[PDB]
Design a binder for this molecule. Structure first.
Ligand SMILES: [Cl-]
Length: 306
């Protein structure tokens, strides 16, 4: 009758794939903390966020956008951040096409959109939805829900396989998923080429529900920050594509929130269906949120100055 920690793991890949690399880690977490740690999977990232909102998920590995939603809607708090095994300070979003495709660039895709099928990402994905949503779509005034022959919304792994198998022409993806696919399904990775790469996205945070007990919070902090001390733990980390965990907080999300608001604002400005007053009202509201955010960001950068 040892207390249970439900650990949410976002659907970047199939649960079967995730278990093979997550189970050794959760077993170590169980041993070190004295809790029974059980994986919580879902079909999409929303399942983890909503699970946390109703206290079915205690702690989770999220991407940055899902962490933002968890903080805003699911009583979440960031306490740690993953660091790439390579030492990279983050990862990147990709657009992928099949190696046989004549689409070889963002311009080729946009120029030919009406003839193409597009695999968009999970709507709570940073690399799969938000990042390309802004840099590829909003900035170029092309709406993925209208521009293509057909669109889908799928996990990273489902998009990669759909492009590999010639079911979708272009899809969103990311560099961490690519490395994983290269390991688990090299025959599929061999069918893929990268036609676009985003700016750097910061490392994924770990988030807990803020009503977790003090004892659980403290033992979890101790576990994450001390992990990687020996060969066994180093192997676990490497298989998860990490080198270590470091301390973080909700302010990790400030630039993510900025990108989210840049996207929403540009999407509203681009929307030719809106009336003059309806548009002006929405943009005023969004610009006030951006002003408040950028003041907070300025405060944080100036305290690092002085
Ligand atoms: Cl699955």
């Amino acid at each position: 009758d040892q207390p249970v920690i439900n650990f949410g793991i976002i659907s970047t890949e199939s649960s079967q794939n995730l278990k093979s690399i997550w189970e050794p880690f959760l077993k170590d977490m169980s041993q070190q903390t004295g809790y029974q740690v059980k994986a919580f999977f879902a079909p999409d990232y929303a399942g983890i966020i909503q699970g946390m909102r109703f206290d079915k998920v205690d702690i989770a590995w999220y991407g940055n956008k899902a962490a933002m939603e968890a903080v805003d809607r699911a009583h979440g708090e960031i306490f740690a951040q993953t660091v790439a095994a390579s030492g990279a300070p983050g990862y990147w979003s990709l657009l992928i096409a099949n190696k046989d495709s004549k689409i070889d660039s963002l311009e080729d895709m946009l120029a030919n959109a009406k003839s193409l099928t597009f695999g968009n990402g999970d709507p709570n994905s940073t690399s799969g939805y938000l990042v390309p949503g802004y840099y590829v779509f909003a900035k170029n005034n092309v709406d993925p829900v209208k521009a293509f022959k057909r669109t889908l919304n799928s996990s990273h792994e489902v998009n990669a396989l759909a492009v590999a198998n010639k079911q979708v022409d272009v899809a969103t993806f990311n560099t961490e998923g690519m490395e994983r696919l290269e390991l688990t399904q090299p025959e599929k990775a061999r069918q893929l080429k990268v036609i676009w790469k985003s700016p750097l996205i910061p490392g994924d945070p770990l988030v807990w529900r803020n009503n977790l007990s003090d004892e659980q919070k403290n033992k979890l902090r101790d576990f994450f920050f001390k992990y990687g001390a020996n060969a066994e733990q180093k192997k676990v980390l490497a298989d998860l594509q990490w080198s270590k965990f470091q301390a973080s907080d909700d302010d990790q999300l400030l630039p993510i929130r900025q990108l989210e608001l840049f996207k929403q604002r540009t999407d509203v400005a681009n929307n030719a269906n809106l009336g003059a007053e309806e548009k002006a009202a929405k943009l005023k509201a969004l610009d006030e949120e951006l002003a408040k955010l950028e003041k907070r960001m300025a405060e944080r950068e100036q305290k690092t100055a002085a």
